[PDB]
Design a binder for this molecule. Sequence first.
Ligand code: HEM
Length: 303
Amino acid sequence: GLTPDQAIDAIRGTGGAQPGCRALHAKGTLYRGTFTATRDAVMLSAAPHLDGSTVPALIRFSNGSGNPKQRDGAPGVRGMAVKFTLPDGSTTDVSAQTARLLVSSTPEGFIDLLKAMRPGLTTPLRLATHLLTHPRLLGALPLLREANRIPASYATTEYHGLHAFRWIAADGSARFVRYHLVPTAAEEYLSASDARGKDPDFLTDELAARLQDGPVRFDFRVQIAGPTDSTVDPSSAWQSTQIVTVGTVTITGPDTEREHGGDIVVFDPMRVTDGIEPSDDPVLRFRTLVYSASVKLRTGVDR
Ligand code: HEM
């Protein structure tokens, strides 16, 4: 179907894939913190970072746009990606953003919507046409709106991993889960009016001041799949309400140790670890390949 390079082309054609920048989620900042799982998390997965010990956590908050100069006050998706360092030095990532469900069940559908939302030219028509070709999306309009809200702070909105992951415990038991990173701070958003007058990078200024005041916390919750919940379609709503907090990410300040010299920081949803396996999700599988392409472009090195 769609190839990694074609995805990058589509992204570039919409304003992303800027020189030296992540093709998408170009604008973002790194923060330092730690993660500690609840005592029962070990019953769900044998992953080392979920055994109750405290591990290092690198967090990047970003704007989904491919434009590194994207204004924070403009409508748009926000991202929160976390990289956990394990005892043996290896790392595992959790990638999440503001939409509750993926707009499409396939990489092809996603890219088509990305292009339909390209220049402001005839966007209304292009989007309308896309919707007629993608009925399911047309029936969840409120979710598309929710995904592009303007948060008062990166710390005052929630993020979702969307894809299902298979969590396997030491006893060999397994369950499929979807990731949700929820703030302990009250959720808060800005009106179009208030957002309009904000500085272009008001979210990073806000977060810097917020952290100076004290740590920021996000609870890591997993939604456990129900009997008819699809483990392969991230655009499909789940009926399960079996959602449990498995840990907390405590962020204490901006990072200054990473992305210097030749250090490359990439949050890949496929970077799992023992006790966690990716589902047969086509978008999930496609992402690692597209990210490798995006990284190669911004760094020059490939993997
Ligand atoms: C098939 C569709 C998708 C494509 C083509 C895509 C592409 C990209 C690209 C090119 C980047 C910049 C990567 C880099 O250079 O490090 C990126 C970043 C990101 N993507 Fe996706 N993505 C897709 C779907 C998703 C989904 C469904 C999520 C939801 C969890 C997501 C969450 C993120 C996040 C959180 C980042 C931020 C990375 C950071 O701050 O370092 N992406 N994506």
